[PDB]
Amino acid sequence: MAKVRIYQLAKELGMETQELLELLDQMGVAYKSHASTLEEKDAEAVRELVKEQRGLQEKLAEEERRKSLPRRPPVVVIMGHVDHGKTTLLDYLRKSRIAEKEAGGITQHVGAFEVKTPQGTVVFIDTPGHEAFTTIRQRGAKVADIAVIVIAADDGIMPQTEEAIAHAKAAGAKLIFAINKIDLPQADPEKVKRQLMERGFVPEEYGGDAIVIPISAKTGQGVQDLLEMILLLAELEDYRADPNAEPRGVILESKLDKQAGIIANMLVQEGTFRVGDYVVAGEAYGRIRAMMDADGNQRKEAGPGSAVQVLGFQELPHAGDVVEWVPDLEAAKEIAEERKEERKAREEEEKARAPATMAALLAAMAEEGAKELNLILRADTQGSLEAIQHILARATTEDVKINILAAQVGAPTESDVLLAQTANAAILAFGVNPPGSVKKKAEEKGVLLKTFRIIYDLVDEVRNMVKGAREPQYKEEVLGQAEVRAIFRLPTGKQVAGCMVTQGRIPRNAEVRVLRDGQVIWQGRIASLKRFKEDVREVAQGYECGIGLDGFDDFREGDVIEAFQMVEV
Numbered sequence: 001m002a003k004v005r006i007y008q009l010a011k012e013l014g015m016e017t018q019e020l021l022e023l024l025d026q027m028g029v030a031y032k033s034h035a036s037t038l039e040e041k042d043a044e045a046v047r048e049l050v051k052e053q054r055g056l057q058e059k060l061a062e063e064e065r066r067k068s069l070p071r072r073p074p075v076v077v078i079m080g081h082v083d084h085g086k087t088t089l090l091d092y093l094r095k096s097r098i099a100e101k102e103a104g105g106i107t108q109h110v111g112a113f114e115v116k117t118p119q120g121t122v123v124f125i126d127t128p129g130h131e132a133f134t135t136i137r138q139r140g141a142k143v144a145d146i147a148v149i150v151i152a153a154d155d156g157i158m159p160q161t162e163e164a165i166a167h168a169k170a171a172g173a174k175l176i177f178a179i180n181k182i183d184l185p186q187a188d189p190e191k192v193k194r195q196l197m198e199r200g201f202v203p204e205e206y207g208g209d210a211i212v213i214p215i216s217a218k219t220g221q222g223v224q225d226l227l228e229m230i231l232l233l234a235e236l237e238d239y240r241a242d243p244n245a246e247p248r249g250v251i252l253e254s255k256l257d258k259q260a261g262i263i264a265n266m267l268v269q270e271g272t273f274r275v276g277d278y279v280v281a282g283e284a285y286g287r288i289r290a291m292m293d294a295d296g297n298q299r300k301e302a303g304p305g306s307a308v309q310v311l312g313f314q315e316l317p318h319a320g321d322v323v324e325w326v327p328d329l330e331a332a333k334e335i336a337e338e339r340k341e342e343r344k345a346r347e348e349e350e351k352a353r354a355p356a357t358m359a360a361l362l363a364a365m366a367e368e369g370a371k372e373l374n375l376i377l378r379a380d381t382q383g384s385l386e387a388i389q390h391i392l393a394r395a396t397t398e399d400v401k402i403n404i405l406a407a408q409v410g411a412p413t414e415s416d417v418l419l420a421q422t423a424n425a426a427i428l429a430f431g432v433n434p435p436g437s438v439k440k441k442a443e444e445k446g447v448l449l450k451t452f453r454i455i456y457d458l459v460d461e462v463r464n465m466v467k468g469a470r471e472p473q474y475k476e477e478v479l480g481q482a483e484v485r486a487i488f489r490l491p492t493g494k495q496v497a498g499c500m501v502t503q504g505r506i507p508r509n510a511e512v513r514v515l516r517d518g519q520v521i522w523q524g525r526i527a528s529l530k531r532f533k534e535d536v537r538e539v540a541q542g543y544e545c546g547i548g549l550d551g552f553d554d555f556r557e558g559d560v561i562e563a564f565q566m567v568e569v
Contacts (some may be wrong), residue, residue: 004043006034010387073269075112075144076176077125079164081132081387082430083454089150092217093124099220108294110307111252117227123267123305124148128431129250132383132455133163134320134409140321142171143250143267146230146237150217151192153181160197174237176211177201177229183216204441243304247271247325251281252307253410254316258291262316263309266302266323273302278332279312281323283340285332286312292543304339319382319409363403365423370399371468374425377407378416380432385409386454388428395459398466412438420447426465430458476566479504483560488530488546496530496546499561501539507569508537512549513562525548526563 010020017034029042080086086204097115098105107113115122125144128134147168151157168175177196179189193203193212202208211233213312215222219478234240246271264281266273273279277288291299302308316566317323326332355362365374379385385407392402405423412434416427430452434442442449452458466472472555485498499506508529514521529537539545549561 004038006031006036006038009043010034036415066242070243071120071304072240073121073123074234074239074241075123075125075267075269075305076146076148077144078129078148078150079131079166079167079302079454080158080160082384082456084130084158084160085152085154085180086130087419089148089178089217090124090126090129092180093148093223096220096223106294106296108296110294111267112131112305112307113294114305115227115446117231120232121305122146122227122230128381128383130160130379130383131164131167133160133386134384136322136386137167137170137390138161140167140171141250141320143269143320143417145173145241146234146322147171147173147175148230149177150174150180151177151195152205153179153184153187153189153192157195162264165199173239174233175201176226177213177234178226179214180213180217182214182222183219186529191216242269242270245271247273249273249323251317251319251321251323253319255410257309260292260309260311262286262311262313264313264317266306266308266310268302268304268306268308268533270304271325272304273306273308273310275300278326278329279310279323280326280332280335281313281317283319283336284313284315284317285326285329285336286310286344287313288312288336290366293533360401360403363405364401364425365403366403369401371466373400373465373467374403374422374423375465376405376416376419376425376427378427378429378432378434379407379409380411380430382409384455386429388458390458391455391543392462397463398468398472400466400468402462411435414441417445417447421445426450428458450525476564477560479510479564479567479569480506480559481562482506484557485544487556488532489555490530491534493530493546494528494548495552496528496548497561498546499545500544501542504567505569506539506545506547506563507565508547510563510565510569513546513564514549515562516559521554522550522552 006020006024007017010017013020013024021031021034027042027045029038065333078086078089093115094113097113098107109126112123112126115124123144135514137364149161149165150253151161165175167289177192179192181187182189193206196203196210196212197208201210203210203212205212210336211229213222213226213229215226227484247268247394249269250267252265252267257263266281273288273291275288275291279286279288283344289309290309291302293299293302294307299306299308363368365372377388379388389404396402403425405425411432412427412429414437419425420427426448428450433439433451434449437543439449442506450458450461462533480503482499482501485500487495487497489495508526510527511523513523524548527550528546529535530546531544532549536545541546
């Protein structure tokens with residue numbers, strides 16, 4: 001070295017005499033032979049230009065090794081609010097996956113289910129489901145790369161399905177639309193097409209770009225045409241994911257087993273989880289001690305789009321929080337601690353001006369509320385509790401203001417029966433029933449526990465709780481009762497009888513009843529008005545006067561009177 005012949009430049013590079021001449025003949029470099037000298041500027045202008053061209057020869061190698069992209073997933077979720085004939089879609093695809101026999105093959109509820117065709121795999125999401133808008137958006141995680149949209153022939157595009165489409169969209173997708181119930185009498189797939197077309201979702205028979213398929217979620221019809229098609233659209237939009245790359249999936253839900261201990265159900269989205277790996281989910285970490293699947297088996301491995309029960313985490317990480325791989329316990333702690341530093345700092349931000357802002361109060365429980373009833377909430381479903389909050393913040397009509405304390409997703413527990421004690425509150429659940437112990441604690445402690453099918457059930461039982469005593473009673477049940485005291489058979493009067501009130505008022509503007517020690521005497525209205533002092537036109541607070549009682553005859557001191565109207569008087 002220090003100096004060079006072009007023949008040595010070639011044995012060093014690992015390039016032909018003529019290749020290196022070809023390189024110099026594109027550069028516009030003057031030369032005599034491969035024994036010629038180069039200039040310091042001209043050998044260095046070869047060295048530097050090689051950095052752009054190598055960086056591109058690896059970009060056109062990462063964008064190609066990333067093209068020959070494996071078997072996938074490529075998940076999908078279906079959308080709207082509760083009692084929507086939306087489980088009914090899921091019901092039908094959860095059975096059309098195994099057309100065959102019982103079973104054998106135990107069909108377990110892993111947050112999802114494989115639907116196994118001739119070229120690969122598509123996994124359909126099996127969970128609530130409604131999403132109920134559990135989170136409106138994560139904003140978000142992208143748990144599934146296809147989304148199968150059901151429009152129901154009985155109901156059509158209820159608003160939750162246009163929000164649902166907007167989760168498929170903003171989650172970076174071309175979209176599949178399923179038309180269920182084509183077998184039912186009142187079924188009009190062309191209304192659905194014109195519903196899709198006034199929204200921009202133009203079908204392929206109208207020269208658009210949004211695929212349509214008539215199917216029956218109870219036959220078995222069009223679910224074939226729907227499967228091949230989902231393989232086509234997977235091809236066309238070219239959504240596949242890697243299986244070697246730093247791992248990624250989603251929690252579907254989390255709970256207990258006597259035998260197993262701490263449990264949670266995980267979709268692996270990307271890469272592979274195995275027994276003995278260390279993991280992180282949310283602020284929660286732990287070691288995979290065991291794995292259990294849909295088919296009830298103990299799993300030595302879980303590959304992409306595997307749903308499983310996982311033994312390993314220290315705390316119970318939340319429904320739809322992402323699970324992620326980490327190099328070491330140091331990363332598992334420090335990642336958990338910055339998200340904890342962020343969410344605690346910001347949750348301290350959030351304290352001010354927050355007793356105000358909203359300004360009811362810190363949900364209203366120190367205003368005289370003039371008929372107060374309270375709540376804490378216990379949903380299954382993050383999407384019910386959003387929907388509940390969206391309904392109820394507007395339903396505050398009759399005087400009482402809804403106070404909604406800190407809430408979660410999943411089943412009842414013994415925390416709710418110590419918060420509802422200290423806050424004097426009601427515990428509202430839907431989808432989810434209370435567990436074993438937890439109803440037996442609640443029902444022997446006097447908290448007004450409730451379960452409902454429809455969120456409209458719950459809210460129209462929240463009405464109840466707007467029973468503000470005096471006015472929503474609406475019974476006309478006696479406006480007063482008054483004991484007789486005397487009567488003036490005075491020859492300057494008529495027939496006025498002292499009466500002492502025992503309800504609201506006795507008025508000159510009012511109807512009259514008379515109730516004996518065993519008999520109804522008589523019924524009518526006030527005609528006269530006389531005191532031992534003067535002929536006054538009203539009596540107010542508890543004072544005495546003589547009133548007149550139509551045609552009567554069982555005079556002087558017979559017994560108590562009972563006058564009624566409306567709250568007017």
